[PDB]
Amino acid sequence: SILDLSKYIDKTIRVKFQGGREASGILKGFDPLLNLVLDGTIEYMTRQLGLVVCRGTSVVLICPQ
Amino acid sequence: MLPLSLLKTAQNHPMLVELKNGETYNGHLVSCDNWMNINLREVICTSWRMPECYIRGSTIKYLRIPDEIIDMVK
Amino acid sequence: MLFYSFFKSLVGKDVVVELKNDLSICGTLHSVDQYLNIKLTDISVTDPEKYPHMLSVKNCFIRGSVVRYVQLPADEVDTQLLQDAARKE
Amino acid sequence: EPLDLIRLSLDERIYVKMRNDRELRGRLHAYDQHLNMILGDVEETVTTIIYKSTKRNIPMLFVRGDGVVLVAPP
Amino acid sequence: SQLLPLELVDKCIGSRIHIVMKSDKEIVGTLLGFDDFVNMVLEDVTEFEIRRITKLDQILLNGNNITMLVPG
Amino acid sequence: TPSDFLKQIIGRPVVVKLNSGVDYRGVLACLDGYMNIALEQTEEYVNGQLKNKYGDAFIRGNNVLYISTQ
Amino acid sequence: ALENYINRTVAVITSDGRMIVGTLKGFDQTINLILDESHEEQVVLGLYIVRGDNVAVIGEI
């Protein structure tokens, strides 16, 4: 993969999703398909979820925080 | 030459990506794959300055290249 | 793989193509591919309002994914062939 | 299997729903897994907001499968 | 050491889950199972637009339009 | 585990919901790997209003959001 | 195949109904077009990369 997600883990990231969703969370886990596991997940649509899993296939953009 | 090859060798250049979303992204290019997923450094995004960004290929509309481009890769 | 074969049997025929964005283009089918991309020669305007912003250009590459309809004439197509080949798949 | 029960109606009048509130009725001539379609003697109705427009294509319209929602009989 | 996401879905099996589409729809019910494409089997699922329906039995939810999964 | 499901409920009564919000109640004749469905069922749940009644139907698998039993 | 169009000027119609004029330089199997001297009349850029997704229609002029 072109992005080394290893650095990010235990770091707060900002992910845009296809369909106009923003999510900010703490990167707990990830895969080669770019599915993520986020912690303290807040979804800006304020919406608070917790430990979420984000489908890599709709993962549209990813920055830090 | 092919889009992908062009990007592949435009590594280290500056470029401006339009998203399907309507978002403009100004950055220097760091990595490209065959899906056209991009990583950029020194980034500014317009509806925000960031260190690094990752962009899925399927969400790009078009990429403005620096005019240097042809001479820099080739 | 079938509709490719079909379109190949339609070359040098006049067809009217309707794309999703409400654009309508008459012309001569010159080429056909696996994505069902079409190439028309002798571009023309079927309808007054839909027709996009062209003129001098006489040849177009149309992306398959952007076509809704292809308009055909009962004369251009053997129905029975089609039917048994569709069964065949 | 759902694609075979479609072979079932070949040469049999069919009713087709497409994205964008359009509806076709015609005689099934051909279909593919993509549910691409050729129909003949087919009438299309477009509902635009309420009015409905019509369009006739007796000879043989082809239809790109990706717009197709439902395929039944009138 | 890495936590794989599919492993996170695996352990929430038989639990309550919220499934958040890429649209404004949401489903909460018991997670019965999932595949590699993250198609999803829910049981007795509430359907919401952000209450549309109370489902009784088993729902296959197409992984295609799934955006977020939330245990609990 | 999803395949077992597709084979478990065939011939049971199901609601199939499409990307557009339309819902189809009918008997499950079959279903393939691409989510294509064989239905021939009514288009209205009840309260909103029944929009069509069709005996036999095919639902394009790209459009399906879910397949649910009652 | 878009091969006959290489290095020639083209009309480009995007799915959203927008219209471009450019030199077609590169193109791939996914219809990613590589473009030069583009105009949307105000010039957009000297070099630009465009996604196949956005392409409705290419015309040779």
Curated annotation (Swiss-Prot), chain B:
Recorded family membership: Belongs to the snRNP Sm proteins family.
Included stretch of the parent chain: 1 to 80 of 139
Keywords: Acetylation, Isopeptide bond, mRNA processing, mRNA splicing, Nucleus, Ribonucleoprotein, RNA-binding, Spliceosome, Ubl conjugation
Keyword rRNA processing attached: no
Keyword Acetylation on entry: yes
Name assigned to this protein: U6 snRNA-associated Sm-like protein LSm4
GO molecular function list: PH domain binding; RNA binding; U6 snRNA binding
Modification N-acetylmethionine, positions: M1
Gene this protein is translated from: LSM4
The organism's taxonomic lineage, starting at the top: Eukaryota, Metazoa, Chordata, Craniata, Vertebrata
Subunit structure: Component of the precatalytic spliceosome (spliceosome B complex). Component of the U4/U6-U5 tri-snRNP complex, a building block of the precatalytic spliceosome (spliceosome B complex). The U4/U6-U5 tri-snRNP complex is composed of the U4, U6 and U5 snRNAs and at least PRPF3, PRPF4, PRPF6, PRPF8, PRPF31, SNRNP200, TXNL4A, SNRNP40, SNRPB, SNRPD1, SNRPD2, SNRPD3, SNRPE, SNRPF, SNRPG, DDX23, CD2BP2, PPIH, SNU13, EFTUD2, SART1 and USP39, plus LSM2, LSM3, LSM4, LSM5, LSM6, LSM7 and LSM8.
One cellular-component annotation, GO: nucleus
Domain Sm, first and last residues per copy: 2-69
GO BP: any one term: spliceosomal snRNP assembly
The protein's role, per its UniProt record: Plays a role in pre-mRNA splicing as component of the U4/U6-U5 tri-snRNP complex that is involved in spliceosome assembly, and as component of the precatalytic spliceosome (spliceosome B complex). The heptameric LSM2-8 complex binds specifically to the 3'-terminal U-tract of U6 snRNA.
Record location of the Glycyl lysine isopeptide (Lys-Gly) (interchain with G-Cter in SUMO2) cross-link: K74
Compartment(s): Nucleus
Main localization category: nucleus
Curated annotation (Swiss-Prot), chain D:
Biological-process GO terms, alphabetical: mRNA processing; mRNA splicing, via spliceosome; P-body assembly
Domain annotation Sm: ranges: 1-74
Keyword Glycoprotein carried by entry: no
Keyword Ribonucleoprotein tagged: yes
GO molecular function: RNA binding; U6 snRNA 3'-end binding
UniProt keyword terms in alphabetical order: Acetylation, mRNA processing, mRNA splicing, Nucleus, Ribonucleoprotein, RNA-binding, Spliceosome
Subcellular locations according to the entry: Nucleus
Lineage: superkingdom: Eukaryota
Any one GO cellular component localisation term in the record: nucleoplasm
Subunit structure: Component of the precatalytic spliceosome (spliceosome B complex). Component of the U4/U6-U5 tri-snRNP complex, a building block of the precatalytic spliceosome (spliceosome B complex). The U4/U6-U5 tri-snRNP complex is composed of the U4, U6 and U5 snRNAs and at least PRPF3, PRPF4, PRPF6, PRPF8, PRPF31, SNRNP200, TXNL4A, SNRNP40, SNRPB, SNRPD1, SNRPD2, SNRPD3, SNRPE, SNRPF, SNRPG, DDX23, CD2BP2, PPIH, SNU13, EFTUD2, SART1 and USP39, plus LSM2, LSM3, LSM4, LSM5, LSM6, LSM7 and LSM8.
Similarity comment text for this entry: Belongs to the snRNP Sm proteins family.
Function comment: Plays a role in pre-mRNA splicing as component of the U4/U6-U5 tri-snRNP complex that is involved in spliceosome assembly, and as component of the precatalytic spliceosome (spliceosome B complex). The heptameric LSM2-8 complex binds specifically to the 3'-terminal U-tract of U6 snRNA.
Protein name: U6 snRNA-associated Sm-like protein LSm3
Lineage per the UniProt record: Eukaryota, Metazoa, Chordata, Craniata, Vertebrata
From Swiss-Prot, chain E:
Record-level GO BP terms: mRNA catabolic process; mRNA processing; mRNA splicing, via spliceosome; response to bacterium
Gene Ontology CC: one annotated term: U2-type precatalytic spliceosome
Predominant localisation class: nucleus
Keywords: Acetylation, mRNA processing, mRNA splicing, Nucleus, Ribonucleoprotein, RNA-binding, Spliceosome
Subcellular location: Nucleus
Sm domain mapped to chain residues: 4-72
GO MF terms held by the record: protein heterodimerization activity; RNA binding
Subunit structure: Component of the precatalytic spliceosome (spliceosome B complex). Component of the U4/U6-U5 tri-snRNP complex, a building block of the precatalytic spliceosome (spliceosome B complex). The U4/U6-U5 tri-snRNP complex is composed of the U4, U6 and U5 snRNAs and at least PRPF3, PRPF4, PRPF6, PRPF8, PRPF31, SNRNP200, TXNL4A, SNRNP40, SNRPB, SNRPD1, SNRPD2, SNRPD3, SNRPE, SNRPF, SNRPG, DDX23, CD2BP2, PPIH, SNU13, EFTUD2, SART1 and USP39, plus LSM2, LSM3, LSM4, LSM5, LSM6, LSM7 and LSM8.
Function of the molecule: Plays a role in pre-mRNA splicing as component of the U4/U6-U5 tri-snRNP complex that is involved in spliceosome assembly, and as component of the precatalytic spliceosome (spliceosome B complex). The heptameric LSM2-8 complex binds specifically to the 3'-terminal U-tract of U6 snRNA.
Family to which the UniProt record says this protein belongs: Belongs to the snRNP Sm proteins family.
Protein name: U6 snRNA-associated Sm-like protein LSm5
Organism: Homo sapiens (Human)
Swiss-Prot record, chain F:
Keyword Cytoplasm included in the entry's annotation: yes
Gene3D superfamilies: 2.30.30.100
Keyword Ribonucleoprotein carried by entry: yes
SUPFAM superfamilies cross-referenced by the UniProt entry: Sm-like ribonucleoproteins
Keywords, comma-separated and alphabetical: Acetylation, Cytoplasm, mRNA processing, mRNA splicing, Nucleus, Ribonucleoprotein, RNA-binding, rRNA processing, Spliceosome, tRNA processing
Record-annotated Sm domain positions: 1-70
Biological-process GO terms, alphabetical: maturation of SSU-rRNA; mRNA catabolic process; mRNA splicing, via spliceosome; RNA splicing; tRNA processing
Annotated localization: Cytoplasm; Nucleus
InterPro entries reported for this sequence: Lsm6/sSmF, LSM_dom_sf, Sm, Sm_dom_euk/arc
GO CC, alphabetical: cytoplasm; cytosol; Lsm2-8 complex; nucleolus; nucleoplasm; nucleus; P-body; small nuclear ribonucleoprotein complex
PROSITE patterns in the cross-refs: SM
Modified residues (N6-acetyllysine): K53
Any one GO molecular function term: protein heterodimerization activity
Assembly description: Component of the precatalytic spliceosome (spliceosome B complex). Component of the U4/U6-U5 tri-snRNP complex, a building block of the precatalytic spliceosome (spliceosome B complex). The U4/U6-U5 tri-snRNP complex is composed of the U4, U6 and U5 snRNAs and at least PRPF3, PRPF4, PRPF6, PRPF8, PRPF31, SNRNP200, TXNL4A, SNRNP40, SNRPB, SNRPD1, SNRPD2, SNRPD3, SNRPE, SNRPF, SNRPG, DDX23, CD2BP2, PPIH, SNU13, EFTUD2, SART1 and USP39, plus LSM2, LSM3, LSM4, LSM5, LSM6, LSM7 and LSM8.
Record PANTHER family: SMALL NUCLEAR RIBONUCLEOPROTEIN F SNRNP-F, U6 SNRNA-ASSOCIATED SM-LIKE PROTEIN LSM6
Similarity annotation: Belongs to the snRNP Sm proteins family. SmF/LSm6 subfamily.
Protein's name in the database: U6 snRNA-associated Sm-like protein LSm6
